[PDB]
Amino acid sequence: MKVRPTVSSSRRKARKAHFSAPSSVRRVIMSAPLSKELREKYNVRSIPIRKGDEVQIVRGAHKDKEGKVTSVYRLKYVIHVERVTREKATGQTVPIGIHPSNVVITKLHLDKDRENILARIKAGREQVAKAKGK
Amino acid sequence: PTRFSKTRKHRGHVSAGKGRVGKHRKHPGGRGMAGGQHHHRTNLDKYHPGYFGKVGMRHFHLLRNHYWRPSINI
Amino acid sequence: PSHKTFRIKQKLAKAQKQNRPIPQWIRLRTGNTIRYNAKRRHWRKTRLGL
Amino acid sequence: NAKQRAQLRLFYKNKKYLPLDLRPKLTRALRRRLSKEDASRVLEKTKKRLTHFPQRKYAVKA
Amino acid sequence: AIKHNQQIPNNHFRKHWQRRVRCHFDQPGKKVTRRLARRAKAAALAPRPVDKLRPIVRCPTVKYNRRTRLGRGFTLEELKAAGIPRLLAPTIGIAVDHRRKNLSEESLAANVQRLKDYKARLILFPRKSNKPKKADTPKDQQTAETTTSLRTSFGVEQP
Amino acid sequence: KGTSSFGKRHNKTHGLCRRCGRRSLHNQKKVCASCGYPAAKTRKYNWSEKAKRRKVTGTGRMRYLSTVPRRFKNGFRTGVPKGARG
RNA sequence: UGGGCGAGGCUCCUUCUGAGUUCCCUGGAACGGGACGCCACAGAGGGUGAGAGCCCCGUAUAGUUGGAAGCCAAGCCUGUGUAAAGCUCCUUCGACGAGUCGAGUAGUUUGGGAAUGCUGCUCAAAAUGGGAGGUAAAUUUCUUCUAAAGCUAAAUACCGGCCAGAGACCGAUAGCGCACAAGUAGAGUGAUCGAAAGAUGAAAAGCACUUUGAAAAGAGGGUUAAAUAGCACGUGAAAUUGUU
RNA sequence: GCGUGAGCCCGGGUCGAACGGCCUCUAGUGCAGAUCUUGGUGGUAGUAGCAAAUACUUCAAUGAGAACUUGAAGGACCGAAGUGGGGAAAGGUUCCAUGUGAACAGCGGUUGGACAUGGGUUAGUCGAUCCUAAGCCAUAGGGAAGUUCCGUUUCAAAGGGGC
RNA sequence: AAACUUUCAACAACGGAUCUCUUGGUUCUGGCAUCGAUGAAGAACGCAGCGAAAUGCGAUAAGUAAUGUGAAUUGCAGAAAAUCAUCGAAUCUUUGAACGCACAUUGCGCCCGCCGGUAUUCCGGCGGGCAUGCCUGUUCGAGCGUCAU
Ligand SMILES: [Mg+2]
Ligand SMILES: [Mg+2]
Ligand SMILES: [Mg+2]
Ligand SMILES: [Mg+2]
Ligand SMILES: [Mg+2]
Ligand SMILES: [Mg+2]
Ligand SMILES: [Mg+2]
Ligand SMILES: [Mg+2]
Ligand SMILES: [Mg+2]
Ligand SMILES: [Mg+2]
Ligand SMILES: [Mg+2]
Ligand SMILES: [Mg+2]
Ligand SMILES: [Mg+2]
Ligand SMILES: [Mg+2]
Ligand SMILES: [Mg+2]
Ligand SMILES: [Mg+2]
Ligand SMILES: [Mg+2]
Ligand SMILES: [Mg+2]
Ligand SMILES: [Mg+2]
Ligand SMILES: [Mg+2]
Ligand SMILES: [Mg+2]
Ligand SMILES: [Mg+2]
Ligand SMILES: [Mg+2]
Ligand SMILES: [Mg+2]
Ligand SMILES: [Mg+2]
Ligand SMILES: [Mg+2]
Ligand SMILES: [Mg+2]
Ligand SMILES: [Mg+2]
Ligand SMILES: [Mg+2]
Ligand SMILES: [Mg+2]
Ligand SMILES: [Mg+2]
Ligand SMILES: [Mg+2]
Ligand SMILES: [Mg+2]
Ligand SMILES: [Mg+2]
Ligand SMILES: [Mg+2]
Ligand SMILES: [Mg+2]
Ligand SMILES: [Mg+2]
Ligand SMILES: [Mg+2]
Ligand SMILES: [Mg+2]
Ligand SMILES: [Mg+2]
Ligand SMILES: [Mg+2]
Ligand SMILES: [Mg+2]
Ligand SMILES: [Mg+2]
Ligand SMILES: [Mg+2]
Ligand SMILES: [Mg+2]
Ligand SMILES: [Mg+2]
Ligand SMILES: [Mg+2]
Ligand SMILES: [Mg+2]
Ligand SMILES: [Mg+2]
Ligand SMILES: [Mg+2]
Ligand SMILES: [Mg+2]
Ligand SMILES: [Mg+2]
Ligand SMILES: [Mg+2]
Ligand SMILES: [Mg+2]
Ligand SMILES: [Mg+2]
Ligand SMILES: [Mg+2]
Ligand SMILES: [Mg+2]
Ligand SMILES: [Mg+2]
Ligand SMILES: [Mg+2]
Ligand SMILES: [Mg+2]
Ligand SMILES: [Mg+2]
Ligand SMILES: [Mg+2]
Ligand SMILES: [Mg+2]
Ligand SMILES: [Mg+2]
Ligand SMILES: [Mg+2]
Ligand SMILES: [Mg+2]
Ligand SMILES: [Mg+2]
Ligand SMILES: [Mg+2]
Ligand SMILES: [Mg+2]
Ligand SMILES: [Mg+2]
Ligand SMILES: [Mg+2]
Ligand SMILES: [Mg+2]
Ligand SMILES: [Mg+2]
Ligand SMILES: [Mg+2]
Ligand SMILES: [Mg+2]
Ligand SMILES: [Mg+2]
Ligand SMILES: [Mg+2]
Ligand SMILES: [Mg+2]
């Protein structure tokens, strides 16, 4: 249950914020879990998804399909996975939009920025665990 | 509560208990105490004898605290 | 008339430039709801007030 | 423009009057209200009794 | 139009009363705001009580003649008899009323005794800690159980 | 009167106002029927709440007034973030 | 009696946050059902292909990473009585607001009644004087203040402005006129007047191709869980109409 | 199927995401009327009608389709106070070229002032601009609680020529 | 007997009710005090690779600087972030209380300075200025209003 006066449990406000969030907020909204191996390696549970990540689909009709994230369409709150596609009437191939929360990240695109992120998350989680274990 | 009122029982009955001949018009007889010395004189004389007129003298700027003396019996 | 002021000529220019159908690629955008130009004006239908 | 304005601010440093575009734009009312020192000025009569009888720090035991 | 045995109606709603209706849906919120303001001002007056010392006063009329209550402030005569300087009284939590007079020795003596008890219970911190003066509490009796509500600790004992 | 008289309608009582832009500037009186130009004060009446709200503040761009709340929130500060190029 | 520090605390910005996507069935898709687990100072809310605490954002808690320095502040360090300031007593003195008060009259206003305030005109003061003391007047007392100059937080009004949180409210003829390129389209010379109008599907996957037709389209065929969901799109009543 | 009844329940079809029973609480709670409001739809009814301005015809081309497109020929009208050639007000792109499904042109339409895509307005000499008219608005002043009214040379210290 | 009319039923039409939904209203509560001659509110006209409108912006024009985040935007094209957040530096057309005089005119002037045309005088280009009421001060003045030599 919410307590803080700054937090609001209004369904209307929550939906408005979600569906009119700017691109930077949509980045955080479109987070995906890490695989078990990456989670053990980095002590990080979830991260915002990025183009060039390798993911495995764990929900929907395309379960168990793996591939590289080729586009993160924030405007449509979906991602595009390599070879996870569909055919139009003309036979032309179009990507299928997958929500990032329906996939798991099996391999991460890592550059100092993507990593300062992981170090911050790991340090925060470790500190919180230590403080709770005091 | 509205569900206990007689208007709910009057639904389906034209004139809502106000009659067909007399029709619940706006203000027959006048507003408030109109016609006290006239068409309403019969009521104002049967009840409230002494409604009209002056009796007694005036006290400008009466301060009620001057007359404070509550009484108790033995 | 042939005699025009610059202000009147400029406003006629603006009306002429606004008198057009909507671009076709607009209707292909995600979340689009514009079907047609709803503010279209014709010289025989609606008189512009100068 | 930024370089020119920085140079102009350096030039007009420690000068009594500087151009309006270089003057700070807070608000009309903010620019018109009394300065801090003028608003805090007090009479000598007030200052004497403020010196000799200020609000004290005190406690009252139960 | 009266129709039966009714009390004669005199409801003053012949103006546009709906234009000036004052509801009070903000009563609990206003109470919360008042409590917050009280807490803030008590914190600001950190060791001091949140109010000023008031004198005992007899209500004016022949009604309420029998009851006493709190007044506005102590008179100059009361302060002089208690030995508290006029300019020093309002700076140590004592309310001063320059326009009230002591027409009776009873009220004068009661208020003087009240002031003397307050002065006996007063703890006066020095203006500068490193050089206390002779009129300040000398740092040893400066620790005691204090009161922050003079309206309760110095109320009307028997109105 | 009627149809035949409507054919003589080829003049203009009102032209475009420079202040409000409406075609309400009386060409002979040279006074705007909407905004009251050229009077200094904008014409506004309390018996037309609709007319008041059609041109009250907020119905236009608010080129300058929309930036005031942010400057107030930050305290009408000046200068640059400690550590800024330039 | 002047100056300067000031631990420490409260602020502010910023980093960070627990737990299943385990097995079986239905389904296009589990977020449904069944089984077995976990977290909970978090089972508020929202999204995700159907009712998700553990898929994601957030949610609880005081903390913490780094930073700016806004406030308060225990206590310290240090000037100094020429000057200035308070108190205790006192013979004496003791300035105090003028076309103002007040009076008459007129108008208005008030609960204010032989006149409550205000204003116009006329008269026009005094020095224990003056005002008031809710019945007009003369006389004699008493009580209470001290007008005709001025400043001043708070408790009070207000949802107009900017933010925020809510509801036994309304649910597209309702709720603001406006859930939409709405004070818009449009009307009027003008002041002004002023609408209608939300919903395919999880995803356009928005029907390739063949055939008939001048074309619009039709018939096959295709997509979809579904096309009698085909942009005249959720459901699809009645009035009214066609065929059987 | 139940109930005297308002109604309640079930079977079948359609459909696609929420909903109901019981006891209390609550109300913007029950429609045939109000020349009721908004919206939709009928009979009338393929009906009234589409009849002022003298009028059309032949061949050919185009086209799916031609009385009202075009070419040629014929027959006619307006008959210089024109159905002619140019302007003022007013309109604003209707002007020109190309193309054209639907809608509009109360019949049709291959045509169009329609729709779509592109073009088009060249000034020392023509106008505005300059002048003053009826008149309007300032100023100095004077009214008005004031929005503002009078005032236009008036009870004003109101300017331009040279070395 | 058909047709026609009517009644009943199935299917198909017409129409948009019903159900369910809701980035919207409405009402209450809490916090805050910040427009403008340093040119506001409002109006006009423009600005995108492909836009008419809405939104945003002002010839630095669907925006520039700066800070933070950290890889998009997306209808197509393109390229090597962003239609991102924040926002303290700037730009900010014609107007508008609107200010050289006007304005139903993109009208007509004057002053200073620079650059050209033979140029203090005319023409052209560029930049900066020229409203009113009032206050303080400055300077130049008027008056037998008045004072001494
Ligand atoms: Mg009956
Ligand atoms: Mg009746
Ligand atoms: Mg009768
Ligand atoms: Mg009756
Ligand atoms: Mg009324
Ligand atoms: Mg005429
Ligand atoms: Mg003017
Ligand atoms: Mg506008
Ligand atoms: Mg979490
Ligand atoms: Mg299955
Ligand atoms: Mg859901
Ligand atoms: Mg399950
Ligand atoms: Mg959930
Ligand atoms: Mg006085
Ligand atoms: Mg008087
Ligand atoms: Mg009097
Ligand atoms: Mg009088
Ligand atoms: Mg009178
Ligand atoms: Mg009056
Ligand atoms: Mg009176
Ligand atoms: Mg008396
Ligand atoms: Mg007294
Ligand atoms: Mg005064
Ligand atoms: Mg006073
Ligand atoms: Mg005052
Ligand atoms: Mg509505
Ligand atoms: Mg509707
Ligand atoms: Mg409406
Ligand atoms: Mg119009
Ligand atoms: Mg619909
Ligand atoms: Mg099928
Ligand atoms: Mg169906
Ligand atoms: Mg369907
Ligand atoms: Mg349907
Ligand atoms: Mg039917
Ligand atoms: Mg559904
Ligand atoms: Mg009702
Ligand atoms: Mg009905
Ligand atoms: Mg009835
Ligand atoms: Mg109707
Ligand atoms: Mg009809
Ligand atoms: Mg016929
Ligand atoms: Mg006829
Ligand atoms: Mg005929
Ligand atoms: Mg004919
Ligand atoms: Mg042919
Ligand atoms: Mg013909
Ligand atoms: Mg003839
Ligand atoms: Mg002839
Ligand atoms: Mg002639
Ligand atoms: Mg011609
Ligand atoms: Mg002609
Ligand atoms: Mg004309
Ligand atoms: Mg043509
Ligand atoms: Mg053609
Ligand atoms: Mg036709
Ligand atoms: Mg046709
Ligand atoms: Mg055609
Ligand atoms: Mg053809
Ligand atoms: Mg056209
Ligand atoms: Mg000429
Ligand atoms: Mg000219
Ligand atoms: Mg002239
Ligand atoms: Mg005038
Ligand atoms: Mg004057
Ligand atoms: Mg029957
Ligand atoms: Mg239909
Ligand atoms: Mg509904
Ligand atoms: Mg500007
Ligand atoms: Mg100027
Ligand atoms: Mg100026
Ligand atoms: Mg002219
Ligand atoms: Mg010249
Ligand atoms: Mg030269
Ligand atoms: Mg020049
Ligand atoms: Mg210039
Ligand atoms: Mg000077
Ligand atoms: Mg002189």
UniProtKB/TrEMBL annotation, chain A:
CDD domains: KOW_RPL26. The keyword rRNA processing does not apply. The keyword Cell cycle does not apply. It comes from the Eukaryota. One of its GO terms (biological process) is translation. Residues 48-75 form the KOW domain. InterPro entries: KOW, Rib_uL2_dom2, Ribosomal_uL24_euk/arc, Ribosomal_uL24_KOW, Translation_prot_SH3-like_sf. Keywords: Ribonucleoprotein, Ribosomal protein. SUPFAM superfamilies: Translation proteins SH3-like domain. One of its GO terms (molecular function) is structural constituent of ribosome. HAMAP family: Ribosomal_uL24_A. Belongs to the universal ribosomal protein uL24 family. This is 60S ribosomal protein L26-like protein. It comes from Chaetomium thermophilum (strain DSM 1495 / CBS 144.50 / IMI 039719).
From TrEMBL, chain C:
One of its GO terms (cellular component) is cytosolic large ribosomal subunit. It comes from the Eukaryota. Keywords: Ribonucleoprotein, Ribosomal protein. The keyword Ribosomal protein applies. Belongs to the eukaryotic ribosomal protein eL39 family. It comes from Chaetomium globosum (strain ATCC 6205 / CBS 148.51 / DSM 1962 / NBRC 6347 / NRRL 1970) (Soil fungus). This is Large ribosomal subunit protein eL39. It holds the Pfam family Ribosomal_L39. InterPro entries: Ribosomal_eL39, Ribosomal_eL39_dom_sf. Gene3D superfamilies: Ribosomal protein L39e. GO terms for molecular function: structural constituent of ribosome. One of its GO terms (biological process) is translation.
TrEMBL record, chain D:
Catalytic subunit of the oligosaccharyl transferase (OST) complex that catalyzes the initial transfer of a defined glycan (Glc(3)Man(9)GlcNAc(2) in eukaryotes) from the lipid carrier dolichol-pyrophosphate to an asparagine residue within an Asn-X-Ser/Thr consensus motif in nascent polypeptide chains, the first step in protein N-glycosylation. N-glycosylation occurs cotranslationally and the complex associates with the Sec61 complex at the channel-forming translocon complex that mediates protein translocation across the endoplasmic reticulum (ER). Belongs to the STT3 family. Belongs to the universal ribosomal protein uL29 family. It is found in: Endoplasmic reticulum membrane. This is Dolichyl-diphosphooligosaccharide--protein glycosyltransferase subunit STT3. The lineage of its organism: Eukaryota, Fungi, Dikarya, Ascomycota, Pezizomycotina. It comes from Chaetomium thermophilum (strain DSM 1495 / CBS 144.50 / IMI 039719).
From TrEMBL, chain E:
One of its GO terms (molecular function) is RNA binding. Belongs to the eukaryotic ribosomal protein eL13 family. Keywords: Ribonucleoprotein, Ribosomal protein. One of its GO terms (biological process) is translation. This is 60S ribosomal protein L13. Residues 140-152 have a biased composition (Polar residues). GO terms for cellular component: cytosolic large ribosomal subunit. The keyword Magnesium does not apply. Residues 126-159 are annotated as: Disordered. Transmembrane segments: none annotated. The keyword Ribosomal protein applies.
